[PDB]
Design a protein around this nucleic acid. Structure first.
Ligand SMILES: Nc1nc2c(ncn2[C@@H]2O[C@H](COP(=O)(O)OP(=O)(O)O)[C@@H](OP(=O)(O)OP(=O)(O)O)[C@H]2O)c(=O)[nH]1
Ligand SMILES: [Mg+2]
Lengths: 162, 48, 486, 69, 1187, 48
DNA sequence: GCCGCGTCAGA
């Protein structure tokens, strides 16, 4: 599950510059995409509200701690503020999987400020397997690298079930 | 490229423009036959 | 000029999965080209009762429209052309299949006739509206119809680059391999053994083969017996059609051999059998080449060990000639000619030495160490003949040597540097003039060839065949054109 | 098609094309396109080539058809 | 060892043993230098008199016709430009400067030779002369809101040139070339007779010219041949030759003969031809200052020709660089100004003829109309002038440095072949030979070399180091091409014993300009740099020596076409030329003075400069960033600051990178792991396979901005209305459209959506009776107006970032229009006033910090000066005519719409490597399908091995090995920083990574622990390596780097197929293979057309895709159709498909009907041809023959 | 090529030209006397 | 009867 839609408090399009913000709106969207989210099985879809008045650097951990929503990337910073100001935005989070670039629905936008954001649903960065024979039997060793959103044993069981 | 080649004919109906007119003209005659037995169709043809 | 409507220009893609008679067409281009046909089908269907209604539905790209377009283009031929139509083979007719993307896809074998490559080249597609034209184009303009060149009998559908290389790699045999001396009753058994992978593809095995063979007189005789063959040759046995001897497959299968096999299949089997064989060979080569995973590396090219000694000897000879000239004993022109000859001889010797080391590898096999043919990728590519040539190998592992100036007289100084070791700035500057002169010559010559072809067409344009036999008994005397040396 | 099968009955590769075109025109003018069979089957021009390949139609018979129309 | 903030943030490894003797000269110096001499005078340079001032002085004195009027030039004053370059481009106005000169006229009694003009006209005034365009520091000109660049022109130098055709023996020729006007020529003959011609004419003996003026046997043969008896007879013969059939005049011939070669305005050498002629004859007796021809000079030229026929002398070479000179744009501007001045002087002489005034001032006579038109005509229509390429910063640098021999006074494209296209020996030091057009213009671009410089005479010069007593001196000098031939130059590559003495007795050097082997003692000079011969663009490619010349040229041309990506990525392997290219191009901000950042935001940068270590200054400076600026190539340009609050900075550091620049380094490509194995035939030839991770990661996504302009014009029937009130249009379609009728900013527009709505009236509809019945049945009225709104073309999707509207002139604005304009002006002034106050507030805070330090009068006027600029900015917005432009009369209003759409790489796209290897993507594969290493990391792209053997681009393989080594180095650093992130151990790891190989000795100790942590984070992806083009690292160093990475000493590595997971037999080389995307998208190339408008004259389809396009059918294609014998296809295509008006409509009806019918009565083009013949006396008609 | 000279010579001669060619037919948009066109004529002759 | 100068016309 990854953010597919983000609405800024004061923007009309992605190509705009906020006052007293070093980061660009497109740069903020790029920072938002790398953000990793963990969701409950039944949540399916939810909306996250972030509002900050800090004069320092905004962060993913700054996101309101709503129930169900989990942010793995506390370290990643959404934006940096040169001077004290009020910054707020809303990001929509839904469960999704990668069906390929050609077979992708753009997604409807109702608000004028709504901005479409692409999301990489798959969480497994790398998969490695090796085979060792104990004699009359073998042992299978698999190395799995993940963002840490999903426990490895559960992911392996799900893949075998599929 | 040169300016003379760019100029295009705008006073002559395009084939798509020509085709649609033909379908409309053919459809009306069928409608007149489908309606009045003969007097109404004759009057409509004479007046228009 | 007669610029014509219903024509499309798009980029060309490799399209390997496509068939020899099938090509890949973007859906949007197909819809625009067949939009009137789609309108007619929609009116016949009753989906739209008016031309305007059909146009409005087409504008919204309704889902039902795509299925109707697929039905309309199911059996409809299209013409693919290139900007330089040097020969009639350049324009050909293929059956379009709807594909995603805006990039046109064409069969790899047809590319050689087109003389175009996937470097951004663009092709134009024309659609025949008349029933006679569409049927006529299929009858004579189809890709399957053209196999041999109009100018020469040799087939133009032969594999050009990688497809030949993979076949050459599989056909090669290894003196020592796992499973050597094994006996396989049928091709399926050999394939199962390869799937297990215990045996080696280059390994030598004995296979019993029984099949019909077609004689020159056309008599068919049964061929049976046990023949020793490589595992790769046995795997290629399944592709070969009935009525063709296993002897043609039982060889190194070099690119020249593949063309001869195709010609033999076409002359006796017929065009359809030859086209099927070509498609099977193309499928096999791509699959085997990837499994081979041949790669090109800096280490693969090998510099000659004795090159330094040869260079020193040549420099000593040049110094002796300079010493003779300084005394005034020898004329300047004779000294220059002698220096050029010495440099050419040294360069030729260096090139000859480089070929032996790369081509030949010595290994300590059981019972002693013996020389065997090298498996180096560069040598295989040069030997295969799919790409490259001896001169390029000589330059990369050899020396540039003499460089021609714009006049073309060889410069007295020569480059002992090689591309792998790099070259000095002065040597690169000396080499720059020849490349620039060649590039200038290539662009200028294009107009002359076209003008000459136009004049020839004008002179022979009206000539045609109108009668089976003139009935004249007068002709010409034909004898071998000996040059006095061969 | 390969036109190779059609060539056995017909000669020169030009007479066959002309005969196929005439047969296709006759079939289209026959009212064959009711619209219930075109979708399930190939176009008429290919159908004429298929008939020539079967040899059932007969090239000589096709010339006789022109006089009827 | 970075020594800089940009260097400090990321440290790049460097290679090579060659010391840097001299820094590279400024790239834009040649373009900037020429304009300054024309517009400026420097005492140190010795340019006391500006060329424009000299041109005014030469023609100023007229003394029309004994009118007691004297014209004298006093001074020239240049007006400040009304709008700055940034303001001028947005308005579309051309940057310009007013030119004013002072004229003094003296008047008096005007009696017959007494007191004619000494007692009157003591009053003088400045008169406006014209408008002069100005050049920005980037050396670019903005015309009509469009940036333009004028290419330098190479032309044959004026002088005397002797050449002999080989057709006949002894056929020597003598040519004299003037800077302007006709040039005389002398041709020898087989009999040995001498002939003289001017440009072109009947052949005549050279003796006639001598007769007009007043061991040698040639004169005796020539004198008897000519029948001329006296000079008058010779003059009459010359006049008859000049004009045929024209009667001779007693005084007419004498004036014409002196005027052709003896008029200073008519004939001048420019001071170059005279200097060459005196040197050629070696005579100082003739005055060098006078550029006019002389009898002695002609006699000397004839003597030189006779001496050459005798055999004493050498024929000149036209191809030689010294004969050829380069002409700057300013010299062309000076020539245009001179032509305008000549026309103005003729007008002034005619103007004096009518006088109706008392004590008339000398302002009415001056007319500025002629001068302004000529300069504007040259700039707007100049062949040399063209739109500057905006694809990349490197492209802008390449275009400015380009010198074109083509243009006026230049060889035609087809006229010269096989002579000027070759590279001369002198070309090595002046023009790079690896860079040229691959098209027919190839060999004419002659792109200037980086170290190439222009002398005052216009001859290119190359820097060299002198050698004394076999010892190389450190002195640097510039050698002219003619001077260079005599000396022998040794290459910089030669090694030294540390005493600057060549160790090798025998070295390769050019003594005659041709490479040869010579002793070290004869060498007199050494090359300043290895890359001096190569052009700046060529130096970018790494491992240039290993690559073939043709492939290198193809790669160099392709790199300039590269398109910028959203995120710039620095190349792992770089020559290090990128940093200089970025700094020289003005796409980045450099701090004027050393200062500490006060405030940083992504709209402007505020910096405070300390006076103690700097020259006196305001103490505050403001830099304004540019966001999403549009480009000629439709490429978005934006600037992002790399500075931080309270960060120490120094002059020359880059505060923020701008276009295609990362950390002060230009990047046009992204590093992708690359394998070299054939896969499934997806890359049979040049095809390229993409893993698709790049598409998902937006590795290659670019932003394109499209401007659509809608204008309103007054037709005879009615004035068109842009108001969104059109009948037959649904509210939902107009729902996006605002009440004003302009689409809302930031609103996504679907293809074919309405951007603006306009209605144009129609009359005499003449509806047919069926249409009349339809109107009657539905009671439907017929509209007297039609709608022609502006809509985006199909297949194009974007959002409206900016909207521009221009109102009418002389008409009071409507409350919505007038209120909107006033609101926009207030917002710009109000935002500026608050923004100006913010700078004023920062200055006040600085004063409070320095309040103890005296500010009472120190900055009293500093705030006042800022206020005047703000008032001018408010005035400039209201300073306009009220439409923001003249608007062109008859245009009611205009609107500008800006749309930006992101683009992602797709199949059929073209990617070109720096080494010149190019390919088009054929398909996108899943990540699992792409082959992976034992670690399991996927390979992004797979390349074909066979292509590399066919073309000797060996450099790419070396770069891939170097890229693999860099990738290995990064992983070790990531492992070290993954755990125990402490500065002390990280410093040791960095010392091992950088100091393990090379003699560079980066000395990382200077960087503080805080800087070290940032540097380690930056190096996580890769470690940068810089290789000199001819000083590249050897294979052994790369092998040692691979060993440090822990990879085997080879590029190839074991790989496993993703689908079967089975390792391929044989290891496969893996390299980064840094790649770039060329600007050749397949989106605009589809060009799908079914039915299109036809040419009015020929009734034939338009082509090129400009409107509906369509593919023309070639004549050669007709020949192929004839060979096929498909007459039915050929006949149908020619008539119904193209020019059959009856056939096309019938064919369309049949296709819609589905019934089968064919009509091809005739082709309209043939009828048009018959009409054209019919107009002539010859008659062509169709006929029936019974014979 | 040389269209003006050929036209000037032809006009005085009043030459009457039967197309008798593939090129002449293409200009008039008529079927060429070669390939399919000859076969169609031969089949038509048999039909008569 | 001829040398040697010339037009045109395509590249
Ligand atoms: N892959 C491949 N196939 C070939 C080749 N040559 C012929 N074929 C297949 O054989 C079928 C023969 O089609 P026809 O035209 O009716 O027979 P013909 O070749 O004898 O004229 C075609 O079926 P089709 O109607 O085109 O479709 P399908 O039946 O193959 O699905 C075609 O796909 C070849 O070189 N490669
Ligand atoms: Mg090409």
């Amino acid at each position: 599950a990854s953010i597919i839609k983000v609405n800024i408090a004061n923007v009309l399009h992605e190509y705009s510059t906020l006052e007293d913000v070093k980061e660009d709106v497109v740069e903020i969207v790029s920072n938002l995409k790398k953000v990793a989210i963990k969701l409950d099985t039944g949540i399916d879809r939810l909306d996250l509200e972030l509002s900050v008045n800090k004069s320092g650097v905004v962060s993913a951990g700054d996101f309101k701690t709503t129930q169900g929503v989990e942010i793995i990337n506390k370290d990643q910073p959404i934006a940096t503020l040169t001077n004290q100001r009020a910054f707020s935005l809303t990001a929509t989070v839904s469960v999704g999987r990668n069906v390929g670039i050609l077979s992708a629905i753009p997604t409807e936008l109702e608000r004028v400020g709504d901005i479409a954001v692409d999301a990489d649903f798959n969480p497994i960065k790398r998969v490695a397997f090796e085979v060792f024979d104990n004699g009359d039997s073998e042992t299978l060793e698999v190395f799995v690298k993940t963002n840490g959103t999903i426990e490895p044993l559960a992911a392996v069981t799900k893949a075998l079930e599929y | 490229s040169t300016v003379g080649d760019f100029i295009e004919d705008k006073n002559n109906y395009s084939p798509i423009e020509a085709a649609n007119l033909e379908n409309l003209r053919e459809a009306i005659k069928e409608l007149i036959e489908t309606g009045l037995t003969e007097r109404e169709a004759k009057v409509l043809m004479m007046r228009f | 000029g007669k610029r014509v409507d219903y024509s499309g220009r798009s980029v060309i893609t490799v399209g390997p999965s496509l068939r020899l008679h099938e090509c890949g067409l973007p859906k949007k281009m197909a819809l625009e080209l067949f939009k009137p046909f789609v309108y007619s089908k929609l009116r016949l269907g009753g989906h739209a009762t008016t031309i305007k209604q059909a146009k409005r539905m087409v504008e919204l790209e309704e889902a039902v429209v795509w299925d109707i377009l697929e039905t309309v283009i199911n059996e409809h031929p299209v013409l693919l052309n290139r900007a330089p139509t040097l020969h009639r083979l350049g324009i050909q007719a293929f059956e379009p299949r709807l594909i995603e993307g805006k990039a046109i896809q064409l069969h790899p074998l047809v590319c050689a006739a087109f003389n175009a490559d996937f470097d951004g080249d663009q092709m134009a597609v024309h659609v025949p509206l008349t029933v006679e034209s569409q049927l006529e184009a299929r009858v004579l303009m189809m890709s399957t119809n053209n196999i041999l060149s109009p100018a020469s009998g040799q087939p133009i559908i032969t594999p050009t680059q990688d497809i030949v290389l993979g076949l050459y790699y599989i056909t090669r045999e290894k003196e020592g391999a796992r499973g050597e001396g094994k006996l396989f009753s049928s091709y399926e058994d050999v394939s199962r053994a390869y799937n297990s992978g215990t045996i080696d593809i280059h390994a030598k095995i004995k296979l019993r083969i029984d099949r019909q063979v077609f004689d020159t007189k056309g008599n068919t005789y049964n061929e049976k017996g046990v023949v020793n063959t490589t595992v790769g040759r046995a795997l290629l046995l399944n592709i070969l059609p009935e009525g063709l001897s296993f002897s043609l497959l039982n060889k190194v299968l070099v690119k020249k051999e593949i063309s001869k096999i195709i010609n033999q299949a076409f002359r006796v089997l017929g065009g359809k059998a030859t086209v099927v064989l070509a498609d099977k060979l193309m499928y096999a080569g791509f699959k085997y080449s990837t499994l081979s995973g041949v790669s090109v590396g800096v280490d693969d090219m090998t510099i000659p060990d004795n090159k330094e000694a040869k260079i020193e000897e040549a420099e000593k000879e040049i110094k002796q000639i300079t010493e003779q000239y300084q005394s005034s004993l020898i004329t300047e022109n004779e000294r220059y000619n002698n220096i050029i000859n010495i440099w050419s001889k040294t360069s030729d010797e260096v090139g000859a030495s480089m070929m032996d080391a790369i081509s030949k590898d010595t290994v300590s096999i059981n019972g002693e160490k013996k020389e065997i043919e090298s498996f180096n990728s560069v040598y295989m590519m040069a030997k295969s003949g799919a790409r490259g040539s001896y001169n390029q190998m000589r330059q990369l592992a050899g020396m540039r040597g003499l460089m021609a100036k714009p006049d073309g007289t060889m410069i007295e100084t020569a480059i002992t540097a090689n591309f792998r070791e790099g070259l000095s700035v002065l040597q690169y500057f000396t080499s720059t003039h020849g490349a620039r002169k060649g590039l200038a010559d290539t662009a200028l010559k294009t107009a002359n060839a076209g003008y000459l072809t136009r004049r020839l067409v004008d002179v022979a344009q009206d000539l045609v065949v109108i009668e089976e036999d003139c009935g004249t008994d007068d002709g010409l005397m034909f004898s071998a054109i000996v040059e006095d040396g061969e | 098609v390969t036109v190779e099968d059609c060539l056995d009955k017909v000669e020169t590769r030009f007479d066959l094309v002309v005969l196929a075109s005439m047969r296709a025109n006759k079939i289209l003018k026959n009212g064959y396109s009711e619209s219930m069979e075109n979708e399930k089957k190939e176009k008429a021009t290919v159908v004429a080539l298929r008939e020539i390949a079967e040899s059932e139609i007969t090239s000589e018979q096709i010339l006789r058809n022109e006089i009827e129309g | 060892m970075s020594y800089s903030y940009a260097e400090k943030k990321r440290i790049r490894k460097e290679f090579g043993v060659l010391p840097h003797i001299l820094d590279v000269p400024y790239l834009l110096s040649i373009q900037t230098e020429s304009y300054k001499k024309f517009l400026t005078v420097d005492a140190a340079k010795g340019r006391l008199h500006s060329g424009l001032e000299i041109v005014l002085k030469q023609s100023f004195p007229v003394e029309s016709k004994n009118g007691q009027y004297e014209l004298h030039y006093v001074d020239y004053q240049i007006g400040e430009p009304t709008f700055d370059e940034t303001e001028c481009q947005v308005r579309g106005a051309t940057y310009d400067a007013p030119l004013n000169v002072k004229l003094r006229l003296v008047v008096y009694n005007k009696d017959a030779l007494p007191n004619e003009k000494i007692v009157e006209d003591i009053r003088e005034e400045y008169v406006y002369m014209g408008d002069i365009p100005l050049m920005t520091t980037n050396g670019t000109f903005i015309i009509n809101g469009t940036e333009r660049v004028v290419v330098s022109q190479l032309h044959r130098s004026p002088g005397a040139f002797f050449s002999k055709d080989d057709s006949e023996e002894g056929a020597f020729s003598a040519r004299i070339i003037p800077y302007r006007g006709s040039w005389l020529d002398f041709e020898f003959d087989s009999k040995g007779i001498i002939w003289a011609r001017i440009d072109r004419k009947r052949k005549f003996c050279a003796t006639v010219i001598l007769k007009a003026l007043g061991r040698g046997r040639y004169i005796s043969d020539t004198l008897k041949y000519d029948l001329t008896r006296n000079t008058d007879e010779a003059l009459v013969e010359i006049y008859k030759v000049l004009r045929p059939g024209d009667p001779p005049a007693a005084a007419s011939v004498k004036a014409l003969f002196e005027g052709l070669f003896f008029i200073e305005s008519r004939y001048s050498l420019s001071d170059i031809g005279r200097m060459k002629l005196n040197a050629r004859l070696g005579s100082d007796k003739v005055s060098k200052d006078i550029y006019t021809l002389e009898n002695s000079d002609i006699v000397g030229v004839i003597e030189e020709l006779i001496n050459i026929r005798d055999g004493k002398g050498k024929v000149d070479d036209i191809d030689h660089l010294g004969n050829r000179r380069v002409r700057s744009v300013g010299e062309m501007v000076e020539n245009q100004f001179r032509i305008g001045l000549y026309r103005v002087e003729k007008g002034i002489r005619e103007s004096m003829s009518l006088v109706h005034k008392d004590k008339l001032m000398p302002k009415d006579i001056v007319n500025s109309k002629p001068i302004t038109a000529a300069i504007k005509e040259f700039f707007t229509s100049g062949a040399l002038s063209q739109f500057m390429d905006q694809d990349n910063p490197l492209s802008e640098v390449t275009h400015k440095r380009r010198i074109s021999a083509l243009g006026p006074g230049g060889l035609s494209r087809d006229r010269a072949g096989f002579e000027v296209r070759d590279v001369h020996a002198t070309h090595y030091g002046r023009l790079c030979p690896i860079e040229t057009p691959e098209g027919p213009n190839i060999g004419l671009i002659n792109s200037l070399a980086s170290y190439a410089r222009v002398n005052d005479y216009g001859f290119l010069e190359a820097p060299y180091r002198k050698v004394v007593d076999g010892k190389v001196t450190d002195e640097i000098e510039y050698l002219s091409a003619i001077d260079e031939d005599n000396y022998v130059i040794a290459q910089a590559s030669t090694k030294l014993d540390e005493n600057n003495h060549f160790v090798e007795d025998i070295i390769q050097c050019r003594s005659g300009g041709e490479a040869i082997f010579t002793e070290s003692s004869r060498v007199q000079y050494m090359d300043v740099s290895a890359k001096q011969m190569v052009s700046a663009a060529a130096a970018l490619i790494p491992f240039l020596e290993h690559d073939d010349a043709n492939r290198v040229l193809m790669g160099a041309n392709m790199q300039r076409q590269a398109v910028p990506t959203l995120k710039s990525e620095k190349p792992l392997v770089g020559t290090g030329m990128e940093k200089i290219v970025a700094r020289d191009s003005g796409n980045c901000i450099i701090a004027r003075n050393v200062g500490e950042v006060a405030e940083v935001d992504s709209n402007r940068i505020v910096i405070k400069v300390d006076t103690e270590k700097s020259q006196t200054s305001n103490l505050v400076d403001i830099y304004s960033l540019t966001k999403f600026k549009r480009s000629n190539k439709n490429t978005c340009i934006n600037q992002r600051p790399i500075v931080n609050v309270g960060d120490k900075v120094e002059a020359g550091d880059i505060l923020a990178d701008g276009f295609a620049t990362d950390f002060g380094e230009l990047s046009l490509g992204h590093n992708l792991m690359v394998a070299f194995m054939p896969w499934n035939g997806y890359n049979f030839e040049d095809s390229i396979l993409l893993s698709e991770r790049i598409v998902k990661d937006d590795k290659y996504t670019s932003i394109h901005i499209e401007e659509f302009t809608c204008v309103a014009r007054d037709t005879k029937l009615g004035p068109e209305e842009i108001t969104a009130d059109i009948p037959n249009v649904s509210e939902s379609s107009l729902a996006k459209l605002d009440e004003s009728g302009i689409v809302h900013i930031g609103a996504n527009v679907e293809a074919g959506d309405i951007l603006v709505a306009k209605i144009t009236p129609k009359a005499e509809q003449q509806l047919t009776p069926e249409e009349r019945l339809l109107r009657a049945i539905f009671n439907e009225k017929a509209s007297n107006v039609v709608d022609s709104s502006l809509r985006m073309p199909s297949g194009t999707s974007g959002t409206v970032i900016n909207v521009q509207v221009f109102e009418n002139d002389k008409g009071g604005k409507s409350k919505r229009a007038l209120k909107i304009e006033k609101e926009l002006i207030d917002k710009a002034r109000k935002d500026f006033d608050e923004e100006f106050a913010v700078i004023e507030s920062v200055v006040k805070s600085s004063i409070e910090q320095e309040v103890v330090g005296e500010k009472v009068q120190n900055a009293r006027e500093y705030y006042e000066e800022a206020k005047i600029a703000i008032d001018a900015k408010f005035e400039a917005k209201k300073k306009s005519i009220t439409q923001s432009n003249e608007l062109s009369p008859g245009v009611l209003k205009t609107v500008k719409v800006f749309v930006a759409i992101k683009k992602r790489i797709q199949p059929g796209d073209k990617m070109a490597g720096r080494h010149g290897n190019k390919g088009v993507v054929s398909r996108v594969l899943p990540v699992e399908d792409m082959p992976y290493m034992e670690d399991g990391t996927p390979v992004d792209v797979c390349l074909n091995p066979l292509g590399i053997p066919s073309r000797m681009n060996i450099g790419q393989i070396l770069e891939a090995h170097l890229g693999l080594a860099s990738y290995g180095l990064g992983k070790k650093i990531e492992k070290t920083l993954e755990k125990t992130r402490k500065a002390a151990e990280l410093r040791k790891t960095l010392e091992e990574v950088y100091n393990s190989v090379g003699d560079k000795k980066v000395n990382l100790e200077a960087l503080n622990d805080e800087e070290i942590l940032t540097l380690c984070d930056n190096l996580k992806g890769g470690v940068p390596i810089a290789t000199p083009v001819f000083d590249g690292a050897k294979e052994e160093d790369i092998k040692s780097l691979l060993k440090i990475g822990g990879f085997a000493t080879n590029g190839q590595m074991k790989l496993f197929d993703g689908r079967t997971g089975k390792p391929f037999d044989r290891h496969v080389t893996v390299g980064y293979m840094y790649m770039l995307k060329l600007d050749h998208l397949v989106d605009d190339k589809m060009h799908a057309r079914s039915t299109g408008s036809y040419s009015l004259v020929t009734q034939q389809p338009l082509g090129g895709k400009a409107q509906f396009g369509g593919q023309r059918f070639g004549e050669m294609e007709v020949w192929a159709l004839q060979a096929y014998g498909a007459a039915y296809t050929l006949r149908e295509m020619l008539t119904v498909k193209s020019d059959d008006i009856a056939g096309r409509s019938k064919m369309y009806k049949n296709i819609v009907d589905g019934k089968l019918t064919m009509n091809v009565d005739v082709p309209e083009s043939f009828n048009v041809l018959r009409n054209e013949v019919r107009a002539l006396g010859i008659d062509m008609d169709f006929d029936y023959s019974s014979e | 090529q040389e269209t003006t000279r050929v036209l000037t010579e032809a006009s005085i001669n009043s030459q009457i030209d039967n197309l008798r060619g593939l090129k002449e037919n293409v200009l008039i948009g008529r079927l060429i006397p070669a390939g399919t066109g000859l076969a169609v004529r031969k089949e038509s002759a048999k039909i008569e």
